[PDB]
Amino acid sequence: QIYYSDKYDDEEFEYRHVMLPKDIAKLVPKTHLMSESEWRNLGVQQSQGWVHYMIHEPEPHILLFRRPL
Amino acid sequence: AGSVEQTPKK
Amino acid sequence: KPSACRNLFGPVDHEELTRDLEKHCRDMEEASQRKWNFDFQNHKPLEGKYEWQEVEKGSLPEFYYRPPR
Amino acid sequence: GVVYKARNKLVVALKKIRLDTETEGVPSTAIREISLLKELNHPNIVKLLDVIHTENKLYLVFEFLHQDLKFMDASALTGIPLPLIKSYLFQLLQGLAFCHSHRVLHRDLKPQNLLINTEGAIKLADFGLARAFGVPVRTTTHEVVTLWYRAPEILLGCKYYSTAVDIWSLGCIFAEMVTRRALFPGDSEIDQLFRIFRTLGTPDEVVWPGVTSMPDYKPSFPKWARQDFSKVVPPLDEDGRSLLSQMLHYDPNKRISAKAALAHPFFQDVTKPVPHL
Amino acid sequence: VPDYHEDIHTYLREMEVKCKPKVGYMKKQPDITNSMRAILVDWLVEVGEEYKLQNETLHLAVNYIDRFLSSMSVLRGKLQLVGTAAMLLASKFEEIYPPEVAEFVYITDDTYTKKQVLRMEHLVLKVLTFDLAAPTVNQFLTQYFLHQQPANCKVESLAMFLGELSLIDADPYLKYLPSVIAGAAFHLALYTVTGQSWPESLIRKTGYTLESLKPCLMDLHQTYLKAPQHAQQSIREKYKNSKYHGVSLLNPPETLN
Amino acid sequence: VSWDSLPDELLLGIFSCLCLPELLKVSGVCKRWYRLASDESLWQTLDLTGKNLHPDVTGRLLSQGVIAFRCPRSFMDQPLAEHFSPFRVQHMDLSNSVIEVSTLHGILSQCSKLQNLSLEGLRLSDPIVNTLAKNSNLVRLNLSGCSGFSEFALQTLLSSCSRLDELNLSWCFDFTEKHVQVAVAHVSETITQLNLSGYRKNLQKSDLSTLVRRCPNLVHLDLSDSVMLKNDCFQEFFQLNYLQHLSLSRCYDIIPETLLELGEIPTLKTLQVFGIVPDGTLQLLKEALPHLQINCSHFTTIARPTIGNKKNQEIWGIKCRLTLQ
Amino acid sequence: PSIKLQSSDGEIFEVDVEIAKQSVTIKTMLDDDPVPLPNVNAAILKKVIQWCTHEKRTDDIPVWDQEFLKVDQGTLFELILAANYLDIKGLLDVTCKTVANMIKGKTPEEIRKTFNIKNDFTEEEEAQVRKENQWCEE
C-alpha cells in the first residue's frame, strides 16, 4: 500500500518522501517528529540513514526524509 | 530478517 | 436564537401557490422549445429548423460531457 | 450520456447538466457560471448563447469547439508548429487580460478543456470556480485546482487569490505545447513545491520579499538554485523568454501584474491555422 | 493600486444602470408596502447574523428582491418565501459554503416546504433573466480602497453601516444610483471622524463633486440622525460590537455642509 | 484611570490579562509605563514556537525572568555578539530547531539553573556539551538525533549531572563503541528511564551487563535496534526488579518463542517487540500472557516534552500564557 | 450581624453579614480614605458576588457587572482605587478585565488621549520602541 518516492539529490543532502495508506496516517505524531525506531514501527521499510526533518501541515499524511551524502 | 534494510521494489 | 425563527405574516394557502409556480414552470417553454426545435423536457430533437447529431463522447472534447460535480 | 451537437443553421452543442439531488437546489457551480458568462463577452472567450431551465434538468448551449491544447496537444509526434504557439497564446493572453480587466477570475486553467477552433482563435472555457473579485475572495481547500497548475502563493497556503494566479497557469505555462511535457508534474503539494524550487530558484527574502511569513514557509526547505534558461530550449532570447514573468516570478505583485503580456517584443507574428484531423 | 482598477470602475458604472430597480413596485403592488419590505430586510439581517452570511450576500439578496418584485405582483404571506429564496441564491453566489435548504426552511419557523423553496428558486431565477452579478453599495465602497489616507481606518465601519442602513429604507434611496449613496457614505464617515471633505482623487476618479452628492448626502444624514430613533432595526445591533469598532455608538455631527 | 499615582499592583493586574502583541504595545506612556511592562512577573511563560529570532532578541526576552521557553522548530541562526546576564530559564525546548552552533554556545553558556532540556535533532559541539555540565539540576535531558561531541565531553556531562531521571540518548550517529561504553559506564545511578536505542554494531552483552549492574532502579528501558542481544541476555533483565516497559524492538538475533520467557517477570506491563514477532505467533504470544500489552504504544514518551495524540502545547505539564497565538 | 462600618465622615449603612468577607481589608478589620458614592456600589456588588459564591486564561464578565460598569472614566478610576483599598478580589478582577478590554486593540495615540498620560513626549525614543518591538509582525 505504502509508496516510496525517488531521491531529490541536493547539495550535501539527499531527500525523499513517503505517503501512508491512511490506515497508518492516523497513527502519526503531530507535535514531535519520529525517529528510525518509530517510523520503522509504523511500517516504513527503507535503508539506514533516513531521518525525518519536517512535517508538512497541509498534508499530515506525508513523511519527509533527508540523509547526508 | 532477510536484509530488511532495503527499499521495497513493488 | 429563536428571534430569527419567526413567521412574519399569516400563513397562506399552499395549493394555489404551488399550482401557480408549476404554471410558470411549464409555460417557460413557450419560445425556447420552438426556437431550437429541441424537446428539452424529453431530450429529443424536433424535425424543425435545427440540425442535430448524436456524436460519441470520444469525438467531441470533454468539456461537452464533463460530469457535473 | 450522448451529447447532441448542432451546426451552423445558416455551430453549438448542448451541455446537459442534471438536477436530481434536491438537497441544496441548483448546484453552486451552475449559478456561479451562468451569472458570470452573461456579462463576460470577449472574442477570445467561449460564448454561452442560451440556457433552458427545465423542471427536472438544466441545459446550456455552447459555441461548438474541438482543438483541446487530446487533439493538438499530444497528437503531434514531430511537435506542434512554433507559429501556432506564437499565436495560440497571444489570443489566450488577450482573453485573460480582458477577463482580469472585466472583474472575473478563471483559476484552474487545465489545457484539457482549453477549447480552440480550427481557424486559430483561442478562447477560455473554464468558469466553474470563477468567483468575481469585485470584493476580496478568501481561499478554499475543497475548490479543486490541478496540482500541476497551482501557484506558490496557493501552495504555501495564502488567503487571497488576487491576480497572477491565472497569469501563469496558462499565460506562462505553455511548456505543455513547446516541450510537450508538463513543466512541474508534482505528485503532492510538497513534492510539487520542491519541483518548483528545482527549476525556479529558491524563495529567499530577496527574490520574494516577505516569503518568511508564508504559512507553509518552513526554513528546512531544500536549498536549490536557479536553472538559468535551459528549461525552455526552443524559444529564443525574447527578453530572456520574457523572464520578467516567465514561469513564475515569485512576486505576484511584480508578476506583470500591472502591464499586460502584450507590450513586449514577443507576439508580433501571424496566426497560422491548424485544420488537420 | 493595480493598473486594471479604473476599467473595473468604468464597467461597474456602466453595469449598475441596467441592474437598477425601478420605483414602480412601491405603488403598483397594493398587496404589500415598503414597511413589510423593511421588516423582511431586517429578518434577513438577523438571518445573516445567525449563519455568519457575508454582508455582500445580504446586499445581493436585497437587490434580487428589489429587481424581482418590480416585475410581478406578490401576494401577502408569500414574501417570506421570496425573501428566503433570495437569501439562498445570494449565498450560493458569494458564500464559499452555502447553507443547506433545511436550515433556510428552519429559519422560517418551519412554515414552508423544501419543494416550495426550490420551486420559488426556479421562478426567481427565471424572471431575473439569470443576471445575478449586481453592482451594489459595498462593492462600490471597496472600489475606493482607502483613498482618504493610506492608513485610514475606523472610518470604513461607519460607511459600511450607512450602506447597510440605506438597504432597509427603500425611499428615498431607490432613485439614487449605488455609486451616489456609496460616495455619500464614504464622505459622511470621513466628516464625522477626521472632519475632512471629499478626497481630491475620487473627484477625478468618479467625476462626482461635493455638489452632485448633496441631495443624497442630506438623506443619508437624516437616516443616520434617527438611526437609534428608528424602530424595527437589527443592523445597528451588529455594528455596536467591538468588531465594528462601535460605529453605532458615535453620534452624528449634525453640522454637515 | 491613568495618573502619576495609580497603584503599580493595579496596573500590573490589568496588564496580566493582555495578550503578547497587546503587551508589546502596552508601553502607552512611551516612558514610565515602559518599565512597568518588562517586569519579570509578566514574562514567565514564553510560547515562542516557530517564527524566527533576531540577533539578541531571544536573549533580551530570556533576560527578564523567563522560565519556560518553548521555542521548537525555530530559525535563530543570526549571531548574538552582545553581552548578556545569566538567564533563569528552567524548562527549555529547542526541539528540531535550526540554531547555529556559535549562537547555541553563546546562549546556552549562561543558563545554569536548567532542569528540563530538549535539544532533539540539533548539531552540538564540545564546548556546548561541557557547559551543560555546569547545571546539575537536570532531571530530564533529551538528546536524540544529536551529533558532534567526543567521548570526553559525554563523560564529563554524564558524570557532573548526577540527578537525571530520564535520558533519551538515542540515534546519536557519529557514535563508536567507545561512546556507548562511556555512556553506559558513567550514566547516573538515579536514572529511572533510558533510551539507548539505535546502536546496532556497538551494543554488546557486556554493556548491558554493566547497565543492569550499575543502575538498579530502571522503570523503562528501550534498547531498540540492538542486533547483538542473542538469547542469553534475558537473565540480565531478570536482575531488574522494577523494569516495566522493556522494548526490545527489531532485535533480529532474538528467537521468537523465547519471548515467552519474558512473561516470568512480574513487574513487566508492556512489551513492544515490533519487527521480530512473525505473523500468527503474535496472537498466541498475546493469548499466553493476558497481562502484557504486546505490540502497543508505538512511540516513545521517554523525556519527550509534548507527548499526546491530541495537539498539545504544554511542555512537561507546564502551559504557557504569553504566546504568539 | 449587621455591621455598617465607618466611612469618610459619611453615612454608615451596610450589613456585611457574609458580605464584607469578600473584602480582604474588611476581613482584617474584623475608614481612612474611602469614597461613599462608589462605596454603596461596592456594597451592592459585594452582596451580589457573595450571592454568586456557593496556567489559567479566561476573560468573561457577567451581565450584572457589564450593566454596573461605571460609564464615566473618573468613576471607573475611583472604583478601581476603592477596590484596591478594600482589597476586593472579584470586583478587582472585573475592573482589571474592563480596563484591559478597553485597552484591547485601539491605538496608543487614542489611549493617551482618553487617559491623563500627557508624558508621551520622549527624546525620540519612540523610534527605539518601534525598532525593539519589530520582531513580531502582526
SS (H, E, C) chain G: CCCCCCCCCCCCCCCCCCCCCCEHHHHHHCCCCCCHHHHHHHHHHHHHHHHHCCCCCCCCCCHHHHHCCCCCHHHHHHHHHHHHHHCECHHHHHHHHHHHHHHCCCCHHHHHHHCCCCCCCCCCHHHHHHHHHHHCCC
Helix axes G90-103, G36-52, angle to 10 degrees: 110
- Read off the DSSP letter of residue D14: E
Q: Report CA E74 to chain centroid distance, whole Å.
A: 22
Cα(D245)–Cα(D237) distance, rounded to whole angstroms?
Answer: 14
Residues of F in contact with B1 (CB under 8 A): 252, 276
Task: Give backbone dihedrals phi and psi of E116, rounded to 5 degrees, phi first.
Answer: -65, -45
The domain C15-50 having CATH identifier 3.30.300.30: the answer here is: no
Among this protein's residues, is D187 annotated catalytic?
no
Asked if residues G69 and G45 have their Cβ atoms less than 8 Å apart, the reply is no
Quick one: residue E154, left, alpha or beta (phi over 0 = left, psi -120 to 50 = alpha)? left
Quick check: do F and C touch, 3+ CB pairs under 8 A?
no
Answer yes or no: is D110 a known binding residue: yes
C-alpha atoms less than 13 angstroms from C-alpha of E216 in its C-beta half-sphere:
25
Q: Are B8 and A45 an interchain contact pair (Cβ–Cβ within 8 Å)?
A: yes
Q: The C-alpha cell of F239 is what?
A: 536482575
The domain locations on chain E are 7-20+134-257, 21-133
Q: Kindly list the residues from chain D whose CB atom is less than 8 angstroms away from the CB atom of residue E126.
A: 53
Separation of alpha carbons F5 and G117, rounded Å: 12
Classify residue F40 by its DSSP letter.
T
Determine A/F contact with 3+ CB pairs under 8 A as the test.
yes
The answer to whether the Cα torsion of D276, D88, C58, D54 is positive or negative is: negative
Q: What is residue F11's three-state secondary structure?
A: helix
Number of residues that make up chain D: 277
Mutate: best of B5, B7, B9, B10, partner A, most A CBs <10 A: B7
φ, ψ at F259 (rounded to 5°): -60, -30
Residues in chain E: 257
Inter-residue contact D217 to D156 (CB < 8 Å): yes
Chains linked to B by 3 or more Cβ pairs within 8 Å: A, F
- Is the separation of the CB atoms in F224 and F198 below 8 Å? yes
Residue D94 CA: distances (Å) to CA of D113, D199, G47: 18, 27, 75
Q: Can chain C be said to touch chain A, i.e. do they have 3 or more Cβ pairs within 8 angstroms? A: no
Please choose, from the candidates F275, F265, F214, the residue with its C-alpha nearest in 3D space to the C-alpha of residue F244.
F265
Please tell me the distance from the alpha carbon of residue D260 to that of residue D246, in angstroms, as a whole number. Answer: 13
DSSP E25: G
Neighbour-count burial of E43, counting CB atoms closer than 10 A to its CB (0-12 exposed, 13-18 middle, 19+ buried): buried
Cβ–Cβ contact C39 with D under 8 A: no
Determine, for residues D9 and C49 on separate chains, whether the beta-carbon distance falls below 8 Å: yes
Closest CA to F50 of F68, F70, F23: F70
**Closest chain E residue to C1, measured at CA:** E50
Alpha-carbon span D44 to D92, nearest angstrom: 7
Taking the Cβ of residue F242 and every Cβ of chain B, the question of whether any pair is shorter than 8 Å is answered with: no
Say yes or no: D31 contacts chain E, CB-CB below 8 A: yes
Contact E66, C29 (CB under 8 A): no
CB atoms within 10 A of CB F154: 23
Which of D211, D201, D208, D214 lies closest to D251 in space, CA to CA? D208
Q: Verify whether the Cβ–Cβ distance E43 to C4 is below 8 Å.
A: yes
3-state helix, strand, coil in chain B (%, to 5): 0, 0, 100
A52 C-beta neighbours (distance < 10 Å), count: 21
Preferred mutation among A3, A6, A10, A63 to probe D, highest tally of D CBs within 10 A: A10
Note which residues in 25-54 of chain E have CB less than 8 A from chain C. Answer: 36, 39-40, 43, 46-47, 49-50
* CA E74 – CA E120 distance, rounded (Å): 12
**Contacts of F244 by beta carbon, 8 Å cutoff, 6+ apart:** F219, F220, F267, F268, F269, F270
For residue F26, give the chain G residue with the closest CA.
Answer: G108
Name the neighbours of G, counting chains with at least 3 Cβ pairs within 8 A: F
- Asked if the C-beta of A1 comes within 8 angstroms of chain B's C-beta atoms, the answer is no
Residue G7 makes CB contacts below 8 A (sequence gap 6+) with G31, G34, G36, G39
| Residue D218 labelled as part of a binding site | no
- Which pairing describes strands F91-93 and F68-70: parallel, antiparallel, or unpaired? parallel
List CB contacts (< 8 A) between F75 and chain D.
219
Asked if D190 lies within 8 A of A62 by C-beta distance, the reply is yes
Residue D138 to residue D158: CA distance in whole angstroms: 9
In Å, how far are C68, D24, D27, E126, E250 from D18, measured between CA atoms?
8, 14, 10, 17, 52
Tell me, yes or no, if B2 comes closer than 8 A to chain A by beta carbon. no
| Cβ-contact C69, D27 below 8 angstroms | yes
Cell numbers for D215, please give them. Answer: 504559512
Domains of chain D, each with CATH number or no CATH: 12-63 (3.30.200.20), 66-272 (1.10.510.10)
3 state DSSP class of D165: helix
Distance from CA of C15 to the nearest CA of D (A): 18
The answer to whether the Cβ–Cβ distance between B4 and A45 falls below 8 Å is yes
Whether D23 contacts chain F with CB within 8 A: no
Name the residue in chain B with its Cα closest to that of A40.
B5
CB contact under 8 A, F312 and A36: no
Question: D70: annotated binding-site residue?
Answer: no
Which residues on B lie below 8 Å from F275 (Cβ)? 4
CA distance C48 to chain E (A): 26
Interface contacts C/D by beta carbons within 8 Å: 87
Chain A residue with CA closest to D154: the answer is A58
CA distance E225 to E246: 16
C-alpha cell at E31: 398587496
Instruction: Give the active site residue among D50, D108, D204, D269.
Output: D108
- Contact partners, residue D206, CB within 8 Å, separation at least 6: none
Query: Is D220 an interface residue toward F (CB < 8 Å)?
Result: yes
Residue D41 annotated as part of some ligand binding site: no
Residue F252, min C-alpha distance to chain B (Å): 7
Number of Cβ atoms within 10 Å of the Cβ of E159: 26
Nearest CA in chain F to D214: F51
Give the gap in angstroms from C-alpha A41 to the nearest C-alpha of chain F: 6
Resolution in A: 3.4
Q: Are D190 and A64 in contact (CB under 8 A)?
A: yes
Give the gap in angstroms from C-alpha F138 to the nearest C-alpha of chain B. Answer: 37
Residue A21 identity (one-letter amino acid): P
- Contact state of F306 with A31 under an 8 Å Cβ cutoff: yes
Q: Fill in the DSSP letter of residue E208.
A: -
Q: How far is CA G122 from CA F30, G109, G112, G118, in A?
A: 7, 14, 14, 11
Chains D and C touch each other (3 or more Cβ pairs < 8 A): yes
CB burial readout D236-274, b (16+ within 10 A) else e: eeeeebbeebbbbbbebeebbbeebbeeeebbeeeeeeb
Those of residues 126-185 in E touching chain C at CB distance below 8 A are 126
Parse chain C into domains and list their residue ranges. Answer: 15-50
Put simply, the answer to whether G76 touches F45 (Cβ < 8 Å) is no
By C-alpha distance, the chain G residue nearest F28 is G108
User: How far apart, in Å, are the Cα atoms of D227 and each of D200, D202, F154?
Assistant: 7, 11, 44
Residues belonging to chain F: 325
CB neighbours of residue F20 within 10 Å = 18
CA distance D9 to F166: 85
Name the nearest CA neighbour of F211 among F195, F232, F200, F225. Answer: F195
Residue D92 belongs to what H/E stretch?
helix D90-100
The answer to whether residues E68 and E37 touch, using CB atoms and an 8 Å cutoff, is no
Nearest-by-Cβ selection for F308 from A31, A36, A38: A31
Q: Tell me the nearest-neighbour CA distance from C16 into chain E, angstroms.
A: 11
Nearest to A33 by CA among F304, F8, E246, E122: F304
Taking the alpha carbons at both ends of chain C, their separation in whole angstroms is 34
How many Å is the maximal CA-CA distance in chain G? 60
